[PDB]
Amino acid sequence: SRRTKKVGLTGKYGTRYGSSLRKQIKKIELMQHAKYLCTFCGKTATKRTCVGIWKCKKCKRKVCGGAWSLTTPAAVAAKSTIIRL
Amino acid sequence: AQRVHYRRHNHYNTKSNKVRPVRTPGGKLTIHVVKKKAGKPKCADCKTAIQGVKALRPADNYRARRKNRTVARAYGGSICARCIRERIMRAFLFEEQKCVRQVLKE
Amino acid sequence: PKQITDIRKFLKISRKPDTTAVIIMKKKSKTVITKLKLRTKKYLYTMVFADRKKAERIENSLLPSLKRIYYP
Amino acid sequence: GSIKRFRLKQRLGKCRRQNRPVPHWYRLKNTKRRHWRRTKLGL
């Protein structure tokens, strides 16, 4: 059944710390453990193993990425800009 | 019951000194220090253990019969079968593709 | 220590120079049975003889110069 | 300890040897004497 009205992933922290602080953490953590789609195979298995390093379980292959995502928007814009030329 | 005690002149419970209780035909419960468990040997490309090859430590790998160390097949106990298969294909395919490309180019 | 099964291999060891001693032992279990141990410098080889008649003939058959031990 | 280095062992023996009391016939022709418990060797 539905454990929390709000908190979800950040429930582990409990009654401690600010709600606003906790909310900011919640967004980044939801992003953090999210499974990305691996463009070296077509499975949704890409996970973060260490700060900037993203491994696909199926491909056993390391994509270099952002701190909290496979792709940061800055990189995506840069990549597109290069592609256009 | 009975108790045990170290016999080997270093009594701390360090990773290489782990110890297994064993009973004697003297009816004495004694202690033996069991050798360290050793890593499997791994393929150069994919870091994954290779069939046939025993997992012996640098002392034991030296004493065993030679057949235990390696595989009668290409890059033997140094590259696994799956990687070799893919590599053999690459070695043919790119060479043909390159020759075709040169013929096309002129 | 090693366990032999082939009567012929046992004989083959028996003829050889460094096979110094034959150690023979006979015992009850429930009926009598025989353990034949051979002492080479490298190893002590044992053959289990389940029949007296075979054992008696082989113990006689051996070269007699080779050293003989009984435990009792 | 159980273990010692050879110089140290030899020295411990030397001190032990040094303790040995004055020979009884000599007195018929002491002031300085190690005792183990309350008077450590220190070296």
């Binding site: 953490i25 390391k62 909290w68 | - | - | -």
Partner: protein, 247 residues
């Protein structure tokens, strides 16, 4: 008094860098004929973590240019690059992400990292996570090039200095807040002994210029001169201005 807390930090005793698990320095492939006159293609074999910085390091293999066989270097990884990618270095290398090119051959408005502040120095500006520089111009007679470092200064470098196409990896690292003290402990544990900080005003006088008093008041101006001597440099060093920002 005695030597102040700031001064002690410098002096080469216990405050030396936390070496032990570091994987070796990140500095680009050194300059040679083969790069200068063309291109050399290498293989990224692995991406590996580093206890010092947010960016991951990239394990790059080249085949040697005057001896048989393969030699391994450590490059700092651009975002969006990957294991098994071919990485190309040199004057004729194509503009594509994670290649290493002379800045003179960039088209304008490209985003780059791994600038050499002066040529052949193996990369020394733009290395921390999520940074980039932007190329802003080429002089009419060539030879120099104009770039923008991420602080906000503009700088002019020689054209034949290296850089790497694409943003530095591990972007956004300080977006995530550090929730609890232990996380901060672990952050500094792999860097340098510099933490917890200790407010200077709470110290005894003998240890620091802000010390003493009965309300922990600073008690004299918090801005000290550029010209100030060694033990005196206290709060806001040589500041142009104080109070909240506008632009």
């Amino acid at each position: 008094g005695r030597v102040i807390r700031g001064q002690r930090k410098g002096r080469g005793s216990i405050f030396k860098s936390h070496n032990h698990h570091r994987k070796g320095a990140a500095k680009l492939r050194h300059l040679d004929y083969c790069e200068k006159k063309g291109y050399i293609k290498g293989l990224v074999k692995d991406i590996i973590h580093d206890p010092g910085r947010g960016a991951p390091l990239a394990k790059v293999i080249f085949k040697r240019t005057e001896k048989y066989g393969k030699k391994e270097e450590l490059i700092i990884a651009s975002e969006g690059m990957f294991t098994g990618q071919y990485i190309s270095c040199g004057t004729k290398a194509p503009l594509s992400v994670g290649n290493i090119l002379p800045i003179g051959k960039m088209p304008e408005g490209t985003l780059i990292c791994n600038l050499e502040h002066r040529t052949g120095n193996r990369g020394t500006l733009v290395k921390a996570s999520g940074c980039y520089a932007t190329v802003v111009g080429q002089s009419e007679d060539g030879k120099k090039t104009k770039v923008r470092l991420p602080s906000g200064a503009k700088k002019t470098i020689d054209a034949k200095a290296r850089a790497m196409v694409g943003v530095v990896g591990a972007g956004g690292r300080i977006d995530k807040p550090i929730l609890k003290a232990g996380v901060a402990h672990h952050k500094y544990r792999v860097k340098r002994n510099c933490w917890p900080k200790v407010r200077g005003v709470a110290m005894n006088p003998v240890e620091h210029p802000h010390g003493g008093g009965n309300h922990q008041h600073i008690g004299h101006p918090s801005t000290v001169s550029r010209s100030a001597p060694a033990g005196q440099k206290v709060g806001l060093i040589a500041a142009r201005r104080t109070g909240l920002l506008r632009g």
